[PDB]
Amino acid sequence: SMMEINNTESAVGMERLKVDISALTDVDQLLFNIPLDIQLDGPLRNTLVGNISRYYTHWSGSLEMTFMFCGSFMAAGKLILCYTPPGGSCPTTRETAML
Amino acid sequence: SDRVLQLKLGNSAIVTQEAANYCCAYGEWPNYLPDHEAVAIDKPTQPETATDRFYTLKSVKWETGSTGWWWKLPDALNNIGMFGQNVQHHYLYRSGFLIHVQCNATKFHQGALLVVAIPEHQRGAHNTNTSPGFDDIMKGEEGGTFNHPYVLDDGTSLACATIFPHQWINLRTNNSATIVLPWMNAAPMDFPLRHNQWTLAIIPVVPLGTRTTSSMVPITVSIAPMCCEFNGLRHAIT
Amino acid sequence: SDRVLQLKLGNSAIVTQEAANYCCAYGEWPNYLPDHEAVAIDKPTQPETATDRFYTLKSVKWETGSTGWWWKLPDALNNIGMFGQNVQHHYLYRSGFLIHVQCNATKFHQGALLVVAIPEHQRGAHNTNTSPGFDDIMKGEEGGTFNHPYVLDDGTSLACATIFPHQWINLRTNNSATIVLPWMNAAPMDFPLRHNQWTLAIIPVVPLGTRTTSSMVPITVSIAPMCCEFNGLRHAIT
Amino acid sequence: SDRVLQLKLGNSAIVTQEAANYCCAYGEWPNYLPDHEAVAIDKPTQPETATDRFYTLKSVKWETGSTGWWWKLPDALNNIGMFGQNVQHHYLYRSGFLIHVQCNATKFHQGALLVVAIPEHQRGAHNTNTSPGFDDIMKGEEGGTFNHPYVLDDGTSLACATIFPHQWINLRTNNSATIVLPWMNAAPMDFPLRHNQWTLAIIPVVPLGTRTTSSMVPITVSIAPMCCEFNGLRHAIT
Amino acid sequence: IESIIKTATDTVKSEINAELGVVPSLNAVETGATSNTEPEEAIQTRTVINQHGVSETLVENFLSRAALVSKRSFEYKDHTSSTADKNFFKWTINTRSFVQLRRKLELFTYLRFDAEITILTTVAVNGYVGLPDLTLQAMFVPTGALTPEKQDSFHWQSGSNASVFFKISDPPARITIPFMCINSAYSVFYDGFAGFEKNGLYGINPADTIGNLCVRIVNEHQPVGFTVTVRVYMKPKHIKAWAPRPPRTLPYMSIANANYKGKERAPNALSAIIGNRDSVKTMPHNIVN
Amino acid sequence: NLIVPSESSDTCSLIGFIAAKDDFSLRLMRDSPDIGQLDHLHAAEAAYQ
Amino acid sequence: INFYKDSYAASASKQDFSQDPSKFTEPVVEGLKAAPVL
Amino acid sequence: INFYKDSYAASASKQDFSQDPSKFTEPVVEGLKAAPVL
Numbered sequence A: 001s002m003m004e005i006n007n008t009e010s011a012v013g014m015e016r017l018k019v020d021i022s023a024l025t026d027v028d029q030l031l032f033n034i035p036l037d038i039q040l041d042g043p044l045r046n047t048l049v050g051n052i053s054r055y056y057t058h059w060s061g062s063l064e065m066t067f068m069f070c071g072s073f074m075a076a077g078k079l080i081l082c083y084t085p086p087g088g089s090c091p092t093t094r095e096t097a098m099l
Numbered sequence B, C, D: 001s002d003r004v005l006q007l008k009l010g011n012s013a014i015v016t017q018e019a020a021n022y023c024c025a026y027g028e029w030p031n032y033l034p035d036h037e038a039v040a041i042d043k044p045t046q047p048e049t050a051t052d053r054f055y056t057l058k059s060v061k062w063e064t065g066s067t068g069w070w071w072k073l074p075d076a077l078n079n080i081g082m083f084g085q086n087v088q089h090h091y092l093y094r095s096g097f098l099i100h101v102q103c104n105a106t107k108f109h110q111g112a113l114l115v116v117a118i119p120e121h122q123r124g125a126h127n128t129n130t131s132p133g134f135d136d137i138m139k140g141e142e143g144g145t146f147n148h149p150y151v152l153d154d155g156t157s158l159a160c161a162t163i164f165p166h167q168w169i170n171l172r173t174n175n176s177a178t179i180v181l182p183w184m185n186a187a188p189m190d191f192p193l194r195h196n197q198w199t200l201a202i203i204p205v206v207p208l209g210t211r212t213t214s215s216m217v218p219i220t221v222s223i224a225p226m227c228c229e230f231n232g233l234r235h236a237i238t
Numbered sequence E: 001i002e003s004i005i006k007t008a009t010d011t012v013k014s015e016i017n018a019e020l021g022v023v024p025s026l027n028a029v030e031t032g033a034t035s036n037t038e039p040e041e042a043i044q045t046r047t048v049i050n051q052h053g054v055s056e057t058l059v060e061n062f063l064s065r066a067a068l069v070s071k072r073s074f075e076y077k078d079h080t081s082s083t084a085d086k087n088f089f090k091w092t093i094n095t096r097s098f099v100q101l102r103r104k105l106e107l108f109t110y111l112r113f114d115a116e117i118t119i120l121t122t123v124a125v126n127g128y129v130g131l132p133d134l135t136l137q138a139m140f141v142p143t144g145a146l147t148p149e150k151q152d153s154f155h156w157q158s159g160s161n162a163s164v165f166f167k168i169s170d171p172p173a174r175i176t177i178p179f180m181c182i183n184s185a186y187s188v189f190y191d192g193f194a195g196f197e198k199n200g201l202y203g204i205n206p207a208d209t210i211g212n213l214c215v216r217i218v219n220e221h222q223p224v225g226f227t228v229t230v231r232v233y234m235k236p237k238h239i240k241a242w243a244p245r246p247p248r249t250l251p252y253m254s255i256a257n258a259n260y261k262g263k264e265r266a267p268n269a270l271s272a273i274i275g276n277r278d279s280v281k282t283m284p285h286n287i288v289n
Numbered sequence F: 001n002l003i004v005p006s007e008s009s010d011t012c013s014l015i016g017f018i019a020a021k022d023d024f025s026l027r028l029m030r031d032s033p034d035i036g037q038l039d040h041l042h043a044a045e046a047a048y049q
Numbered sequence G, H: 001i002n003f004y005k006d007s008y009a010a011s012a013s014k015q016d017f018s019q020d021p022s023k024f025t026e027p028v029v030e031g032l033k034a035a036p037v038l
């Protein structure tokens, strides 16, 4: 079920369910991050896994995030999606997140 | 394999060259009512190819500001062809449906439609205590438009609507969607004029965009009733 | 038999000519985590000889007024060698430990050190309601000193501390102590930067004394991590 | 078949939808050092998934005037992650490499990159008798640029460089290249800070061109060390 | 394929891949199937033997706990001058009044269950004399039966209605009602109209009508007044559930319909269900040391 | 980089989805903080009338 | 313990461990492969 | 007497007479003798 990743002011309604990507002129730039808190309010809360899990206190097991690219057929690109196990701050550079 | 499809029912056929497989709702296929589930004791009429064929609705224009569209079943078909005539002359109806949604654009267009079949899509009104009236619900062949697709017009969630039978038309990937719906009711048959089992919702979660010269980008809906049965013959309500 | 010992782990070896046997805590030996107890599903790194080797800490001087010394594990090793690097780059850690404590003097010296490994040595503060802070607990490689060894700094009892895995260095008898610690936690693995499984305490229950010319009498601590595993690779916290 | 590829090593994975098969250098696959070829008698550390995973370097911009780029192995990785830590703490190293080069553009772009892995790419200087210095060779993670790619900066020949393990990225055909490198040395292990076994060279033999609106066209390099072994543990040179 | 699942699945160890033509991390969301990528295919894994049970998420366990469905307070007094619940009340039975039960039930399209009903009564003196140990009568009045008009009307003789008589000093009164729909399941949602004319109620299936609960104090009034509160609890049991639904996000407005307004600002506003963060690059609870 | 020709839109969207895998487990049921009421709902009183 | 004559009077039935999640996760007519899906 | 469906509901389990005091009294790698210990 869709994550509300664009939970920002000036994103209204349906606009909150998508993230817009543009061509950049600097290499290896950060595009977005996703807070992984299901208990605190965040992109995961209003999801099927999220809503059902909030009837419970304890959880275990793996999650899958799937991303669908919805540009035109002629659009091309490569993204790197990173999960960082806990302990420090969220990485802000690609060569940190790549680890 | 998964990309090309032909559907043939009665005197009607559809081909697509950009399918994305197709959905059978909850893994079921339409069937006729068996004797061990039947209630009404009169012998049903089963018109077969006269009813169990694709009917094409009026197309809708996809625009930058579109909120999405909906049609209720059987309501949208209750006045069309021999399906409509049997609906009007019979107290009781049962069928499945084959839904095929069509939308094509160039390789320079982008956009994504969620095509979702919702069982018992009981609508809410916005910002009132008064329940939706008859003319808010019973749109017929023309269908309706979403007021607040973000909550599915029922105080709920577009984001979680993938729990229902659905496909996407992502213009980059595919240009049609197909959903097969079984009979989906608490009773074995129903009065077709006062209850809708299914609502087809088409919602543009990613808006239509391009930098080519603009064209009208229509969305077209073709629905085949499947395994139609009718009971309780009388005069036409019509 | 019981008096001489050699310990060899990786590129490191220790010999003693005055051991007093050695302690295996609760009769266990270190082992790797078996599949039927495992939680984290990523494949662990097991560096073996890069981590599972003796590291020697800074020596402490035994003095007439000494209250005793303590070090927390893994905290004391979290910045040392390849053990420290794996700690800093991984979310999860597990290991046992081999502890070897060294102190020699002449045949005219007297003194007795209790060498005790305490699991979950949650410290108290003296004469306050405020709990110990981060810098009171996390002493790292240098370790700490006992404030009130008579109550083990936790409102309890040095006299009953023999309930924990321990040896003595009685200068008349022996000049080293050895304790083997298994993994000792309620979870199968842990975050090494926020929890200490074990505290090594060295307490001079009989003070150092002699009438020869005085010399510096150091106490030296060598610890080998055993069966190290690390899970959850990321950037270094460091 | 040959067009789509997934590479999975440790916690890292790469997918490509436009591969052109992939190269195994001289038909070899990486392996650990067998006992009948081994020299150093200490037990090696083999960190597996902590080292044997993709590291991504900084991207370079493809421009109309580009001469091409190079990176030396292990030099480019000697400061990255747990591979870098093991490099700094150990005298001896051995590994293979998995090299994956990424560059995409539109169907209106043209350009061809030769992606070649050169063993022992001993560089020359132009127009001097003085040999290249340490800072001319040891570029680390950033890599270098070709001065005279036509002679491979070594008085030789780009045209004959196809004698080395290579692929092309022809923007019309494919958007990634993959080369698997075995250990390639005269000794069974080496000191990683003074000798480079392999040089990755990316050279634009056909320049980037289009008449669409221009965009930044980056080239990205991801390298996985494979079957890493380290011997001779000591303090970190770092 | 249908299978008996008692515990979460094991993880198998996995090696390095590098196979041409095999791309298990790529998917096609447009089909409407959920991603089939396994963890063993995304990363190198160890073997884990998984012993975690799944019984607490069984639908029986998720729904079969007793929740408040009705709560009514009324004056127990001499009512000759009152204009009011005169020592009795009538309740038209529904599940839509208390939102915690409502939201859980509305996760499904169809439900079949028997209803365990627990009736809890409490009393306070009106503004002390001690608390009377009153006898109450609850009577179930089905569709088309006559409801009582008065505390002492002859409808309370209950010749064929089911009644339970219970004391305040007793434990809570308890009875089970069977699954009583004229269909094979209740319609939790109903995209339809209740009558053959156009003016019938939208959104309520006539097939799911339970009836009325009538509760009186059986005692005559005392010389002083009391306030009596009756609480009704319902526990579904022997449950079947079909067609799971997206949960309710906006506050409920009415028991009669799904009408919606939202909160004034996020969370759970009509424009924004999740509360905002400064940007898609902002981590709100970022660990810093 | 995202690279598009002039006739494609210069800006493109991702939709992100999440699900659990079948190794997932939940425990200790509680009242969800996602719903609440401060008042009686409209027409909840009318059920007593 | 159930001495009532009607079977609906019984306590709850918490023993049904049958699942088929594919009716919600995989309602595609041609099953997915572990392999390009389109 | 236990008619509850959850086994943790049962009364206390006072029947476990297994001991191994040597894990606290004799954690030496070479066992003591009944004989000079050092």
Ligand SMILES: CC(C)Oc1ccc(C(=O)Nc2cccc3c(-c4ccc(CN)s4)ccnc23)cc1
Pocket (backbone or CB within 6 Å): E069, E093, E094, E095, E115, E117, E138, E139, E140, E162, E163, E164, E175, E177, E186, E208, E209, E210, E213, E232, E234
């Ligand atoms: C007097 C005594 C002998 O009998 C009774 C009889 C009934 C009660 C009582 O309140 N039941 C009840 C309270 C609330 C709900 C129900 C339901 C529902 C199932 C699905 C629904 C959606 N529409 S509703 C069914 C039967 N009952 C219910 C209490 C006592």
